[PDB]
Amino acid sequence: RLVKALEDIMVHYDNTTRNSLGNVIQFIYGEDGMDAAHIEKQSLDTIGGSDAAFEKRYRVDLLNTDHTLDPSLLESGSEILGDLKLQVLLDEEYKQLVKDRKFLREVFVDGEANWPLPVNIRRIIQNAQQTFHIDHTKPSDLTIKDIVLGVKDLQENLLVLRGKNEIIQNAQRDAVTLFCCLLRSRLATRRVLQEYRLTKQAFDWVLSNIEAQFLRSVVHPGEM
Amino acid sequence: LEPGHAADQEQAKLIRSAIEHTTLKSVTIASEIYYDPDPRSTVIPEDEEIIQLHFSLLDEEAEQSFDQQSPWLLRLELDRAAMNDKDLTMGQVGERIKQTFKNDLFVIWSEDNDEKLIIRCRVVRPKSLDAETEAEEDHMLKKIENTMLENITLRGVENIERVVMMKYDRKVPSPTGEYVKEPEWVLETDGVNLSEVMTVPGIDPTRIYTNSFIDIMEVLGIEAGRAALYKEVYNVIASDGSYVNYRHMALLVDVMTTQGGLTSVTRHGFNRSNTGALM
Amino acid sequence: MDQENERNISRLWRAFRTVKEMVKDRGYFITQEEVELPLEDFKAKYCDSMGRPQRKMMSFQANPTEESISKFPDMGSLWVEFCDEPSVGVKTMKTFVIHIQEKNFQTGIFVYQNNITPSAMKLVPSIPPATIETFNEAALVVNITHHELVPKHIRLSSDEKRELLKRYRLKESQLPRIQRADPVALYLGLKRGEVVKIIRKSETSGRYASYRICM
Amino acid sequence: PKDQRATTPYMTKYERARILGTRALQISMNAPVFVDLEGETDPLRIAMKELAEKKIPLVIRRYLPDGSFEDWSVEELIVDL
Numbered sequence: 001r002l003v004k005a006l007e008d009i010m011v012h013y014d015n016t017t018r019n020s021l022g023n024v025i026q027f028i029y030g031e032d033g034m035d036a037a038h039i040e041k042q043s044l045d046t047i048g049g050s051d052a053a054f055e056k057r058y059r060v061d062l063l064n065t066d067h068t069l070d071p072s073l074l075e076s077g078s079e080i081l082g083d084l085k086l087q088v089l090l091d092e093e094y095k096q097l098v099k100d101r102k103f104l105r106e107v108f109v110d111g112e113a114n115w116p117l118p119v120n121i122r123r124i125i126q127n128a129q130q131t132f133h134i135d136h137t138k139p140s141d142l143t144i145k146d147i148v149l150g151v152k153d154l155q156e157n158l159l160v161l162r163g164k165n166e167i168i169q170n171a172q173r174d175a176v177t178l179f180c181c182l183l184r185s186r187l188a189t190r191r192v193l194q195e196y197r198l199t200k201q202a203f204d205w206v207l208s209n210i211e212a213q214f215l216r217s218v219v220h221p222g223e224m
Numbered sequence: 225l226e227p228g229h230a231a232d233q234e235q236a237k238l239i240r241s242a243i244e245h246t247t248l249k250s251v252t253i254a255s256e257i258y259y260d261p262d263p264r265s266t267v268i269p270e271d272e273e274i275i276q277l278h279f280s281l282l283d284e285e286a287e288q289s290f291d292q293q294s295p296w297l298l299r300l301e302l303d304r305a306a307m308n309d310k311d312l313t314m315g316q317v318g319e320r321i322k323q324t325f326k327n328d329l330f331v332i333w334s335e336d337n338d339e340k341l342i343i344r345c346r347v348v349r350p351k352s353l354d355a356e357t358e359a360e361e362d363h364m365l366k367k368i369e370n371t372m373l374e375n376i377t378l379r380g381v382e383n384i385e386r387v388v389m390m391k392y393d394r395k396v397p398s399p400t401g402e403y404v405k406e407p408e409w410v411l412e413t414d415g416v417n418l419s420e421v422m423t424v425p426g427i428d429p430t431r432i433y434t435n436s437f438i439d440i441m442e443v444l445g446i447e448a449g450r451a452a453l454y455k456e457v458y459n460v461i462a463s464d465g466s467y468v469n470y471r472h473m474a475l476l477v478d479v480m481t482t483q484g485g486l487t488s489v490t491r492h493g494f495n496r497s498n499t500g501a502l503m
Numbered sequence: 504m505d506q507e508n509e510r511n512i513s514r515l516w517r518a519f520r521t522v523k524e525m526v527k528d529r530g531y532f533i534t535q536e537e538v539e540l541p542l543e544d545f546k547a548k549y550c551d552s553m554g555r556p557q558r559k560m561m562s563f564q565a566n567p568t569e570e571s572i573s574k575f576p577d578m579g580s581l582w583v584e585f586c587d588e589p590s591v592g593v594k595t596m597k598t599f600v601i602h603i604q605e606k607n608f609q610t611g612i613f614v615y616q617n618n619i620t621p622s623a624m625k626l627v628p629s630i631p632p633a634t635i636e637t638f639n640e641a642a643l644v645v646n647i648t649h650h651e652l653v654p655k656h657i658r659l660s661s662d663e664k665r666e667l668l669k670r671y672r673l674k675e676s677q678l679p680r681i682q683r684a685d686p687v688a689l690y691l692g693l694k695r696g697e698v699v700k701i702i703r704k705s706e707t708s709g710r711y712a713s714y715r716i717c718m
Numbered sequence: 719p720k721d722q723r724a725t726t727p728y729m730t731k732y733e734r735a736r737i738l739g740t741r742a743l744q745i746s747m748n749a750p751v752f753v754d755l756e757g758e759t760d761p762l763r764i765a766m767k768e769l770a771e772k773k774i775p776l777v778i779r780r781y782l783p784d785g786s787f788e789d790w791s792v793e794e795l796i797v798d799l
Contacts (some may be wrong), residue, residue, distance in 0.1 A: 430650050446681055
């Protein structure tokens with residue numbers, strides 16, 4: 001009975017799911033366009049944790065002493081002190097993380113943090129560390145602006161639907177909301193400098209690999 | 225329950241009482257029809273004290289008339305234990321009977337403290353009983369007894385049987401931001417009457433849920449019906465621990481709910497559609 | 504609790520609040536203060552000294568907001584009337600229809616107590632282009648659109664619907680369907696052919712917008 | 719639609735399967751070989767070798783549910799499989 005009911009439903013090249021009549025069952029397969037084979041459980045950091053712990057893990061301040069970024073974490077850590085521009089960028093990043101926290105707490109009322117998602121970023125960062133033999137005692141050569149702009153560019157490259165109009169662009173931006181949340185929670189400046197003392201080469205490698213990997217993760221048109 | 229009443233106990237019991245369906249038949253021991261021409265007294269010493277209790281109250285009322293007085297006594301003896309369990313008093317049942325029998329049945333009450341919970345009733349028939357206790361047909365009293373024991377809803381929601389209040393934990397953000405388990409009191413019933421139970425005061429209408437997704441569709445719409453159907457499928461599949469990806473069950477429910485209504489996978493549902501004849 | 508007791512006044516007040524919220528969500532202008540009327544204030548304004556509210560005094564008129572009329576230049580004025588008769592005979596429906604016709608109200612909502620006779624129901628489509636909506640006070644006691652399961656429904660303008668169909672290369676039939684009698688459809692007062700945007704908080708993705716077409 | 723093609727620029731799994739199958743069938747049918755055959759014998763392996771070099775002339779017509787289509791040449795498509 002089940003096989004006959006859903007027999008003729010297929011993913012088409014416009015990424016929608018339709019039956020033999022062309023009727024739309026859903027406007028993107030699985031509501032995010034990724035195939036099940038490439039999903040796997042991952043943690044959403046921002047959902048859990050106390051406000052103080054969340055701020056400590058994510059907030060970075062170049063001006064005040066409450067959450068100062070230790071200068072030893074960057075090859076220009078001393079210079080960045082002040083620089084209202086970098087502070088504005090980091091404040092925007094923290095506001096985005098707070099918005100993600102609120103949005104996720106809305107989506108998952110019970111606060112569950114482990115949910116399937118396409119690309120496993122923990123493995124990507126572990127691979128970067130093992131490949132580049134990153135030394136945890138050498139102040140990384142990354143810069144706050146580089147990190148922020150790289151993450152934003154990656155988010156811009158999270159292509160599922162490739163239309164040029166505004167309806168398809170809204171759909172595509174919606175389809176990557178949760179993966180963007182995972183990225184922002186995982187690639188926070190503070191985390192990328194303290195927890196994962198990556199270098200610029202490793203950061204570029206991680207971003208490129210994430211791009212490629214979820215691009216390989218998207219469902220194939222013609223899938224029955 | 226509502227957020228301001230969930231953490232407590234007795235308010236949950238009050239909601240239980242407001243929802244749970246209960247009739248006279250659940251509290252009555254036996255119903256007896258007795259012969260008693262006397263409208264103000266009785267040949268039965270057992271009911272003499274009860275009659276005297278209301279003799280100074282009812283028979284002393286102005287505009288005394290026998291139109292509601294008959295020689296037949298429909299004596300119901302209730303269960304004290306059952307009434308105590310349901311938090312029912314002679315009051316509630318009496319005015320419910322009055323509501324169903326505004327002026328077609330003169331009803332006498334027994335004192336709650338009395339060991340004999342008695343509802344002494346007489347037939348009503350104006351223009352024939354006005355000044356006499358004429359022998360009304362006993363079948364009239366038997367029909368009245370049927371109506372009392374079947375068609376009288378003392379309290380609760382129709383089609384809602386035993387309501388089982390129980391406690392289990394739900395995660396809510398602590399003021400520090402951490403998710404902590406806050407014990408909550410809820411009710412799990414039998415039979416579905418969403419359309420009424422939603423409106424009962426004291427319940428959080430935004431959280432009420434049922435496993436009969438058809439009623440969810442009827443009351444909340446096709447989108448809530450689809451969500452409830454997915455929840456039911458997920459519960460069925462995860463009852464054994466093993467789980468399937470969200471996409472498969474989401475696709476199944478989406479297919480079942482594309483036509484603005486619940487479609488079955490039978491030959492009456494997807495098979496009677498617009499698809500190809502050979503398909 | 505008698506009819507005059509709070510057991511019924513509270514239900515009436517909650518239905519009033521639900522009606523105000525429903526009219527506000529349709530795009531008409533209703534101040535947030537009116538939506539949050541306290542029970543005591545409602546009794547003072549409407550409930551009689553005898554405990555019997557004058558339902559005729561709860562009659563209500565709403566007008567499209569600036570944004571709603573800008574997006575829906577066909578919108579008109581709304582009239583809402585809570586009838587007094589427990590049973591809606593054809594005479595009361597005829598009187599209401601005449602009132603709508605003479606006031607030239609584009610849309611009118613008729614909230615009734617118990618039931619409407621089929622003869623009266625036959626008068627609903629009797630005054631085009633004006634449309635008459637009927638609601639049962641019991642249904643309106645709780646605003647079903649506030650339920651956790653129910654997502655947010657948004658009505659699309661004809662231009663928005665045309666653009667959607669053009670971008671997805673769809674026909675009117677190839678969209679998912681929503682019936683006219685759907686409780687949310689009645690709440691939004693959808694007409695046949697009006698497409699509704701539904702925004703859900705998907706598990707796989709943060710949000711997922713789907714659409715349905717009234718049938 | 720000659721441009722603004724909204725379909726994926728990556729050759730799909732089924733597209734790869736059918737391209738390799740078609741080229742294997744053609745080579746088995748003694749079709750011309752476009753690559754420097756390095757002593758290979760299996761038509762499928764030759765097809766894979768000349769797909770690696772983007773030396774398969776065939777294109778891929780991608781039908782949309784409304785009947786339209788897009789012509790993608792295997793030289794354009796990115797073989798990320």
